[PDB]
Amino acid sequence: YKLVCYYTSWSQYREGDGSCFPDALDRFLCTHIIYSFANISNDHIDTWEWNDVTLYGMLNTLKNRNPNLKTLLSVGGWNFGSQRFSKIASNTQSRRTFIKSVPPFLRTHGFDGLDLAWLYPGRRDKQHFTTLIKEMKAEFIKEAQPGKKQLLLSAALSAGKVTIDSSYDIAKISQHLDFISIMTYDFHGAWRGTTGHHSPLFRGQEDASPDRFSNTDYAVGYMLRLGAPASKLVMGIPTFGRSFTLASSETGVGAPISGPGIPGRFTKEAGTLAYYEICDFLRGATVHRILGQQVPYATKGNQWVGYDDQESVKSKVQYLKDRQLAGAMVWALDLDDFQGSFCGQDLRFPLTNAIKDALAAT
Numbered sequence: 423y424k425l426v427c428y429y430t431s432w433s434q435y436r437e438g439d440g441s442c443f444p445d446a447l448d449r450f451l452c453t454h455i456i457y458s459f460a461n462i463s464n465d466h467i468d469t470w471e472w473n474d475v476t477l478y479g480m481l482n483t484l485k486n487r488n489p490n491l492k493t494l495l496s497v498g499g500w501n502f503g504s505q506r507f508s509k510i511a512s513n514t515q516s517r518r519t520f521i522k523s524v525p526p527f528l529r530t531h532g533f534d535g536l537d538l539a540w541l542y543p544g545r546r547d548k549q550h551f552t553t554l555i556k557e558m559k560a561e562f563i564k565e566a567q568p569g570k571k572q573l574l575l576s577a578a579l580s581a582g583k584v585t586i587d588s589s590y591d592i593a594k595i596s597q598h599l600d601f602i603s604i605m606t607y608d609f610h611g612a613w614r615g616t617t618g619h620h621s622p623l624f625r626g627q628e629d630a631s632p633d634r635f636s637n638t639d640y641a642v643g644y645m646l647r648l649g650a651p652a653s654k655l656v657m658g659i660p661t662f663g664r665s666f667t668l669a670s671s672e673t674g675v676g677a678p679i680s681g682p683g684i685p686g687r688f689t690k691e692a693g694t695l696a697y698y699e700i701c702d703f704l705r706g707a708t709v710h711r712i713l714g715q716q717v718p719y720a721t722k723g724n725q726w727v728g729y730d731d732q733e734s735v736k737s738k739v740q741y742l743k744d745r746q747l748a749g750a751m752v753w754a755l756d757l758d759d760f761q762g763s764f765c766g767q768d769l770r771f772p773l774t775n776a777i778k779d780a781l782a783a784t
């Protein structure tokens with residue numbers, strides 16, 4: 423199957439062993455490595471980080487020893503502002519300028535395709551988003567009409583029902599996109615005020631869940647039913663967990679919280695912990711397997727973190743294989759123990775490799 427992995431340019435800035443550059447990625451680990459994110463200035467796909475061009479090369483160099491490794495550049499991101507993206511896609515001239523600027527930029531920097539990370543189209547952008555995808559694929563087909571291996575077009579889509587209903591025309595965009603990575607995580611935010619695994623495989627205990635849709639299973643199925651071909655659907659598996667600060671002695675799912683979890687030493691962001699940061703957290707912590715959800719959560723002191731580990735990701739892969747999906751999508755390589763020094767076993771990319779093995783197994 424496909425193993426789409428994201429590399430986030432900003433992961434380079436993390437202190438010490440946290441810092442991650444494309445040259446630190448196992449070229450054989452994934453089938454597709456997506457660089458995040460590229461900006462859009464003057465309606466042209468442009469770099470984001472000062473050293474993007476350098477990192478671009480650093481990444482694509484991984485293709486030398488591995489011809490089969492495809493690489494995509496992801497335009498969009500959360501810091502992009504769906505507003506700017508809305509305008510660019512709304513305006514017809516602006517849309518063309520951008521679409522046209524992509525093929526060159528990709529070929530110029532060694533990318534095998536483009537990933538649309540519009541996070542996220544508004545209720546008013548459903549059509550614009552369909553168009554943008556349709557015309558972007560048009561251009562990629564054109565730019566390769568002569569005989570070039572056509573540039574790939576993918577899109578990172580929300581796994582949340584609400585967003586899916588208001589922003590995506592799954593049926594349509596699924597024809598034009600080569601594959602869609604369904605961001606099946608971040609289902610439970612600190613804002614809810616209770617502990618909850620952010621990336622459950624299934625809904626789990628009926629009483630214990632807030633939404634009937636805040637779980638991987640529902641999203642995957644919802645999308646399928648909405649017209650997304652299973653063969654074009656890549657299921658997102660996070661290598662990071664969402665943390666919470668407990669507010670009482672209760673440590674189970676649905677326990678009271680005072681807010682996000684204490685920021686991780688390297689990711690410096692409340693409510694988030696890279697799997698490697700989690701491996702340190704597990705030291706002295708207690709791991710609980712959430713029955714029905716197939717995912718673990720660890721708690722220690724006033725901290726609670728729901729995450730994915732070797733076992734859970736293996737289960738998620740079975741789920742997706744049993745669903746006959748295109749494969750798994752990982753977010754992100756820099757969040758996995760890419761150093762292989764935090765979770766012991768000296769094994770680099772424990773989670774992602776677990777996923778790889780699971781996909782190749784049986």
Ligand SMILES: *[C@@H]1O[C@H](CO)[C@@H](O[C@@H]2O[C@H](CO)[C@@H](O)[C@H](O)[C@H]2NC(C)=O)[C@H](O)[C@H]1NC(C)=O
Nearest residue numbers: 460461462463464465468469470471472502506
């Ligand atoms: C991505 O592109 C946008 C648009 O060109 C950049 O935003 C401009 O930023 C300057 C100063 O930061 C402002 O004076 C302009 O008015 C902005 N233009 C727009 C359209 O908002 C943005 O800085 C770029 N980001 C990166 C990382 O390249």
